[PDB]
Design a protein around this motif. Sequence first.
Motif, short mmCIF file in Angstrom:
data_model
loop_
_atom_site.label_atom_id
_atom_site.label_comp_id
_atom_site.label_asym_id
_atom_site.label_seq_id
_atom_site.Cartn_x
_atom_site.Cartn_y
_atom_site.Cartn_z
N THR A 40 0.92 1.27 -3.11
CA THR A 40 1.74 2.44 -3.38
C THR A 40 2.39 2.37 -4.76
N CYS A 41 2.83 1.18 -5.20
CA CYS A 41 3.52 1.00 -6.47
C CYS A 41 3.41 -0.47 -6.92
N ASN A 42 3.99 -0.79 -8.08
CA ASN A 42 3.86 -2.09 -8.73
C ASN A 42 4.56 -3.24 -7.99
N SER A 43 5.43 -2.94 -7.01
CA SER A 43 5.98 -3.98 -6.13
C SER A 43 4.85 -4.69 -5.38
N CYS A 44 3.81 -3.93 -4.99
CA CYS A 44 2.61 -4.48 -4.37
C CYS A 44 1.95 -5.48 -5.32
AG LIG Z 1 4.22 -0.92 -3.99
#
Ligand SMILES: [Ag+]
Length: 72
Positions: free
Chosen positions: A13-17
């Motif tokens: 979903t986003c760069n935290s992944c």
């Molecule tokens: Ag993410």
Amino acid sequence: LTQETVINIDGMTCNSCVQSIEGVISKKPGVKSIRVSLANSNGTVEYDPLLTSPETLRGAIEDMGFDATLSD
Ligand SMILES: [Ag+]
């Protein structure tokens, strides 16, 4: 000798992944260089066959909670 695997990781979903995945995987035995991408939705992991495998890596990503499958 070492090998490299391109694991397709869908549901990012986003760069935290990206951060979490590379963080976890970098600590796995046998892993060396790693390049995870949101944009390409994948994880390019250099590893030692004797210590870990594409299936181990794929497994861990799946355990975190993403659609983890090999490029081939
Ligand atoms: Ag993410």
